[PDB]
UniProtKB/TrEMBL annotation, chain A:
Signal peptide: none annotated. HAMAP family: Ribosomal_eL37 (MF_00547). The lineage of its organism: Eukaryota, Sar, Alveolata, Apicomplexa, Aconoidasida. Zn(2+) 1 binds at C21, C24, C36, C39. GO terms for cellular component: cytosolic large ribosomal subunit. This is Ribosomal protein L37. Component of the large ribosomal subunit. The ribosome is a large ribonucleoprotein complex responsible for the synthesis of proteins in the cell. One of its GO terms (molecular function) is structural constituent of ribosome. The keyword Magnesium does not apply. Keywords: Metal-binding, Ribonucleoprotein, Ribosomal protein, RNA-binding, rRNA-binding, Zinc, Zinc-finger. PANTHER family: 60S RIBOSOMAL PROTEIN L37 (PTHR10768), RIBOSOMAL PROTEIN L37 (PTHR10768:SF0).
From TrEMBL, chain C:
One of its GO terms (cellular component) is cytosolic large ribosomal subunit. It comes from the Eukaryota. GO terms for molecular function: RNA binding; structural constituent of ribosome. This is 60S ribosomal protein L13. The chain holds residues 2 to 54 of 215 of the full protein. GO terms for biological process: translation. Belongs to the eukaryotic ribosomal protein eL13 family. Keywords: Ribonucleoprotein, Ribosomal protein. The lineage of its organism: Eukaryota, Sar, Alveolata, Apicomplexa, Aconoidasida.
UniProtKB/TrEMBL annotation, chain D:
It comes from Plasmodium falciparum (isolate 3D7). It comes from the Eukaryota. One of its GO terms (molecular function) is structural constituent of ribosome. This is 60S ribosomal protein L39. Coiled coil: none annotated. GO terms for biological process: translation.
TrEMBL record, chain E:
SUPFAM superfamilies: Ribosomal protein L29 (L29p). The keyword Methyltransferase does not apply. The keyword Ribosomal protein applies. Belongs to the universal ribosomal protein uL29 family. Keywords: Coiled coil, Ribonucleoprotein, Ribosomal protein. GO terms for cellular component: cytosolic large ribosomal subunit; large ribosomal subunit. It comes from the Eukaryota. This is 60S ribosomal protein L35, putative. The lineage of its organism: Eukaryota, Sar, Alveolata, Apicomplexa, Aconoidasida. NCBIfam families: L29. InterPro entries: Ribosomal_uL29, Ribosomal_uL29_euk, Ribosomal_uL29_sf.
Length: 89, 121, 53, 43, 119
RNA sequence: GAUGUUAGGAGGGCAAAUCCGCCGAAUUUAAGCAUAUAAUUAAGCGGAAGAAAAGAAAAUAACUAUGAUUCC
RNA sequence: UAAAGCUAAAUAUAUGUAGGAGACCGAUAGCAAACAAGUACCGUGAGGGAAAGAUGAAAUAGUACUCAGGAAUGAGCAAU
RNA sequence: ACGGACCAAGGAGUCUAGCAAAUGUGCAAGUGUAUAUGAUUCUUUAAACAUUUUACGCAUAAUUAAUG
RNA sequence: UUGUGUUGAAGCGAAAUACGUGAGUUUUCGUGGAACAUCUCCCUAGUGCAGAUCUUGGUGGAAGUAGCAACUAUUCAAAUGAGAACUUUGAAGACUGAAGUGGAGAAGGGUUUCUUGUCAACUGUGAUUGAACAAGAGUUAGCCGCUCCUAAGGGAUAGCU
RNA sequence: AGCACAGUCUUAACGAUGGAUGUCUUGGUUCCUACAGCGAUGAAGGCCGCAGCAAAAUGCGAUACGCAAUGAAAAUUGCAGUGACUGAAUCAUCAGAAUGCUGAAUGUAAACUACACCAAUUCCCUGGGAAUAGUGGUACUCCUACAGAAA
């Protein structure tokens, strides 16, 4: 009559279901059952799949800041001893 | 040419030229040294400095010579004190010459330059 | 099949793009093996690497 | 909502900060800019 | 605008007091910038670099002191210990892998691999 | 066997191209379709290295015999 | 001569990184992406996912001046 | 009867394995040098060169379930 | 193999007492501002378009046409500004008729809030207004709530697969 | 000062929106070679911040578009300001120091910047003097060594 399947139904959207997902930062943390959709924050693993090339590559390593890994890169060629310093003048 | 360790590819090297750091652009900022200075200092060329005396020998302004004022490695240019040009607004600024077109005829010796001329010797 | 030809016997009915691998590197692998064995014998004070059989 | 969480308020501040336009004198040497009504942040 | 070597000799207490007064001066310059003033905005970068260098030299001195306090003793704190990779630390020792039983050791010593040439 | 903010140490997750086990399909072909075929594959789960896995015969031949494993 | 165990080489790499090449493509092509790209954007979600390169030698030659108009802009004998 | 408002660009019998036939070439009862080996080759060279007196494939002889 | 190129090539528009039979080739003029062909013989290919309700991008007629219609209704004088049917002030006539276009709030939106300037685009009409643009400013709790306890329930601990 | 029917179509010349063709390329693709794990010593990823005037991207972690040190070694500049006549302005390398909140996340949960409990904690001086409500620790499993209970 007035709350039909179309616009009438569309007018009742309130009280969303997903949120920030502290681990991911994406908005796929369903609230009514306490579980994310991207990683599964309550769970342990990152919830990866192999049928999703995009969901693999757009979130694979190398995208982020890479604080420690790209620091420990290019130390192999030096292969120096930690705690050693270059000779002064 | 002969060493396969050093690449010869147009793209892979022109890219390096454009994005090279200023510490490497200092090497390319150089130009020919005058004839008398060549046999006086046993060298062929040397980079430019802000207080050098150079002769311009190419382009529309290849007649004068004067002391340079400032360099700009971001634009690959050097400025000489007397070949300025006015703009539409009336402001006057020094024209930009690529170092390949100029030859130094007097350079200001320095503590730093003495040892580089030593290593050239 | 079309008239007087041999009966086809192609064993390509399964996926094979997944497993095709040609060898472009034959000659350079040969050169690498040569260099490796030459260095191995050079580092051995002149004693021949080969063994009697 | 008149009631909001701390992280949500901080994120709204961050987004409003992002909404600021490009400074003038930098142009002497943008395209990712939302509108409060045209595009919903969703967060 | 102080420099590193001219601080590398100062006493810790004077260094800390210098850092505190530099922080106070930087705070004052921030007050000036925040208020309607727009003149003294330059020196703030120099001050923020001075404090950084003072902190760096202080921290390095403290690190050498707290390494000197714990010479040898085979129980260096975890941060003061090595920072190699995980499987490098958990890797077998070179002596551990080169260790071998007296049987094979004696066999190899008695019949070592030996050099030779042919006619 | 219990008990321990006992001393000293380890495991957890990320990353997979090559590799290692399990589970495990169908589309398709057979001009239909059920054995078969796709395939001991795809998907999923679990595990490492710079290579791994395999490896020193409860082997192969049957000959005047060869002689760990791997690969072309 | 089973039912316990160990081991380098010869071998593989559509990953990451670092180098070097080409009878390859040349901006609807080539990776989705030569540029602020897995960005904007869409879907509450699994996820889906673009368009956009070239002034000029030098803008340190980027349109000064006059007149008209509110300004846009226009015209000049003015000007790069 | 169906598609076509218009314009510019892109747009479709290709590649591989195997066989056969036709043609051209070398050799010829032999043929092919495979993996691989050596070399003052080692920008181009990821190609060319080279292969101590049964390695194999295909052919020299066919036929029968088969001892042959 | 052997040439053309700043005395302007590639392309493109118009054309040629031009050649073929024909795909096309070759030329003149204008524009252009940096490369171009080999037909001497050959090797190679992501190679020749009108279509596929082909795809991408752009442009038509249809056409200054349909249309700009609910919520009763506006009129005058002035200020503003160059500009005023739809900005501001006054007069007048009306409406909403306490189940209100009134106050507070929730979910949602997230600076739209206020002030000072503001018209490139938008506000499908005008526009000086604005929920547009620009620059600043603005949310004060022992007592208002959350934080506390417990429900249908969720997650997890011991064991068990 | 005068002359032209209009409209429709066709042809030439001169122009408008559109950006193919032609030419450029800090791009990609393929192939070859070389090396190869990271992490309770706090990983990958994500939030939050960082410039005088500072949005993005790159970079950076309360030392926050960079510190120290080595080499190169005189500019950075949009305005300002900073620099020597070279441990200084700017580059490359980066081992020293630092590396917020998180995140397998690990004292107890999360749409909370929520709440515990044990040590009070740190700095300065070489037994004191200061300071802070601020700092560490407390996950589950397991191995070795230790303790007091059981039968």
């Amino acid at each position: 009559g007035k709350a039909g399947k179309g616009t009438g139904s569309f007018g009742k959207r309130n009280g969303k279901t997903h949120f920030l997902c502290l681990r991911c930062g994406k908005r796929s943390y369903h609230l009514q059952k306490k579980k994310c959709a991207s990683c599964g924050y309550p769970s342990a693993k990152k919830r990866r799949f192999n049928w999703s090339v995009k969901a693999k590559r757009r979130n694979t390593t190398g995208t982020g800041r890479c604080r420690y890994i790209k620091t420990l890169r290019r130390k192999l060629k030096n292969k120096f001893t930690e705690g050693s310093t270059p000779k002064p003048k | 040419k002969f060493n396969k360790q050093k690449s010869s590819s147009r793209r892979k090297m022109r890219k390096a030229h454009f994005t090279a750091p200023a510490g490497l652009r200092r090497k390319i900022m150089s130009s020919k040294l005058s004839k008398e200075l060549r046999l006086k200092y046993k060298t062929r060329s040397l980079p430019v400095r802000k207080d050098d005396e150079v002769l311009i020998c190419r382009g529309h302004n290849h007649g004068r010579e004067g002391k340079v004022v400032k360099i700009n490695r971001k634009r690959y240019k050097i400025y000489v004190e007397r070949v300025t040009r006015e703009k539409v607004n009336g402001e006057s600024t020094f024209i930009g010459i690529h170092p390949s077109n100029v030859v130094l005829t007097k350079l200001k010796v320095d503590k730093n330059r003495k040892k580089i001329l030593d290593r050239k010797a | 099949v079309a008239h007087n030809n041999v009966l086809p016997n192609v064993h390509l009915h399964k996926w094979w793009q997944r497993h095709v691998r040609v060898n472009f590197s034959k000659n350079i692998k040969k050169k690498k093996r040569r260099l490796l064995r030459e260095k191995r014998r050079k580092a051995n004070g002149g004693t021949p690497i080969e063994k009697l059989h | 909502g008149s009631i909001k969480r701390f992280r949500l308020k901080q994120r709204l501040g961050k987004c409003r900060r992002q909404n600021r336009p490009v400074p003038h004198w930098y142009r002497l040497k943008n395209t990712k800019r939302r509108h409060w009504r045209r595009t919903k942040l969703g967060l | 605008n102080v420099k590193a070597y001219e601080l590398r000799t100062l006493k810790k207490k004077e260094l800390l007091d210098k850092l505190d007064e530099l922080k106070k001066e930087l705070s004052g310059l921030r007050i000036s910038k925040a208020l309607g003033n727009s003149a003294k905005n330059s020196k703030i970068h120099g001050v923020r670099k001075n404090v950084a260098r003072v902190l760096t030299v202080y921290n390095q001195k403290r690190k050498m002191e707290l390494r000197q306090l714990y010479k040898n003793k085979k129980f260096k704190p975890y941060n003061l210990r090595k920072k190699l990779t995980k499987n490098k630390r958990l890797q077998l020792s070179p002596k551990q892998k080169a260790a071998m039983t007296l049987r094979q050791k004696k066999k190899v010593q008695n019949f070592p691999q030996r050099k030779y040439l042919v006619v």
